[PDB]
Structure 1
Amino acid sequence: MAPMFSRIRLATPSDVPFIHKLIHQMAVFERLTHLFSATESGLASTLFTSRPFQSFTVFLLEVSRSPFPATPSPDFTPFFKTHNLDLPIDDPESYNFSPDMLNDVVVAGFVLFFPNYSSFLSKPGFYIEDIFVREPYRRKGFGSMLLTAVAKQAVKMGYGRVEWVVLDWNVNAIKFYEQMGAQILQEWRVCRLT
């Protein structure tokens, strides 16, 4: 039995290797590795050109068996959660997700989002492009914490809705979203110009 603490914080440039590995794990999970062409240089030079919440923004979820310290944006401060005693985590990839090998802090998941716009309300919102929790850390509430963190940020900033898309056959994801109070819209279809 071990304790567990979590923290959600903003990603910074030094987190690019973790973000890259998380996106790669997502591609493997989606069975779309052949579409994975992301690079660390591309992530660094596209995700951090603007300030947090101005354009692309990433929240990272980290976990530790010990409390985090008390202390990238004036509009955000990290969230903390304490979890109940449970079996220790078995994480074969911890060495790829540790900012410091000697410290017991591991990146467990992320959400990538950016501002969208409700024109009929003249009000920004947020759109979530990706949400992913690594396999050893699932079914502990982390995905829900990540999604609701974006919603809490929206409320804080006076923004409107949070939106995303799901595959209609993805009844598992639909279940995960329904339990969050999300509405699934049947009437819209995504259009694309290559």
Structure 2
Amino acid sequence: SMFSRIRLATPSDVPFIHKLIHQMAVFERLTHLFSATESGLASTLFTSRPFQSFTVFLLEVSRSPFPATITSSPSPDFTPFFKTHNIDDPESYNFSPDMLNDVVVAGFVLFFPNYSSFLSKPGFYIEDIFVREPYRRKGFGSMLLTAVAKQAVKMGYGRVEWVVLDWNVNAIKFYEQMGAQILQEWRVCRLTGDALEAFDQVNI
């Protein structure tokens, strides 16, 4: 048996969030895009309460059962999610929130509220899901997505949204099986870098 739990991240989890983002960049061969720092994460991710703005769920695993609750959870609207599964992790020591306890961080989902004007209802947008290598091929990416959807339902939020690569045919079919719809008409536009910084010069 391997036990898993999904909980809310708090400021003390910044080292693990930093390392998970780095491993995600390594996995994607995108480390040239990585400039995240622990200070940057610590000063930006936790300026609001969970679900108020940026929110991170952490996936943790253990060979022994987790506690049934988290009494110190940073939100009153959240109780952890759990699953039991029927493994060598050399990086365990860099992912243990309590060095003496047999629990390691295995993945994360980062999400934040979006909004539907026509409904006057918030929803969630999922920005990143990443599961580190020893825990891959076990369905944990889907478990983290499911956790965000379940939280949206508990809170009465209107929609959960994310993006998918046009060619990722297997993920598209997976999302459709869940009842999600791929909105074929929209394209994402991004203003960044020197192009964004040039707006400093507009006389308004």
TM-score, normalised via structure 2 length: 0.87
Determine the C-alpha separation between the residues in 1 that align with 2:23 and 2:178. Answer: 24
Percent identity of paired positions between Structure 1 and Structure 2: 99
1:170 shift after superposition: 3.0
Determine the C-alpha separation between the residues in 1 that align with 2:35 and 2:173. Answer: 30
1:82 alignment partner in structure 2: 84
1:25 shift after superposition: 0.9
Verify: 1:118 aligned to 2:116, yes or no. yes
1:175 shift after superposition: 4.6
Distance 1:106 1:175, change over 3 A: farther
1:54 shift after superposition: 0.2
Equivalent pair of 1:144/1:180 in contact (CA under 8 Å)? no
Determine the C-alpha separation between the residues in 1 that align with 2:155 and 2:67. Answer: 26
Distance 1:138 1:90, change over 3 A: same
1:31 shift after superposition: 1.5
Deviation above 6 Å: which 4+ runs of structure 1? none
Distance 1:139 1:176, change over 3 A: farther
Determine the C-alpha separation between the residues in 1 that align with 2:119 and 2:6. Answer: 30
1:32 shift after superposition: 1.1
Uncovered stretches (5+) of structure 1, i.e. residues with no partner:
none
- Pick from 17, 20, 23: which aligns with 2:18? 20
1:172 shift after superposition: 4.6
1:177 shift after superposition: 3.2
1:69 shift after superposition: 1.6
1:182 shift after superposition: 2.5
Equivalent pair of 1:115/1:125 in contact (CA under 8 Å)? yes
Determine the C-alpha separation between the residues in 2 that align with 1:93 and 1:172. Answer: 30
Verify: 1:105 aligned to 2:108, yes or no. no
2:6 alignment partner in structure 1: 8
1:134 shift after superposition: 0.8
Larger Rg: 2
2:159 alignment partner in structure 1: 161
Number of aligned positions between the proteins: 187
Greater displacement, 152-161 / 162-171: 162-171
Alignment RMSD: 1.5
Determine the C-alpha separation between the residues in 1 that align with 2:174 and 2:156. Answer: 26
Determine the C-alpha separation between the residues in 2 that align with 1:78 and 1:137. Answer: 19
Uncovered stretches (5+) of structure 2, i.e. residues with no partner:
193-204
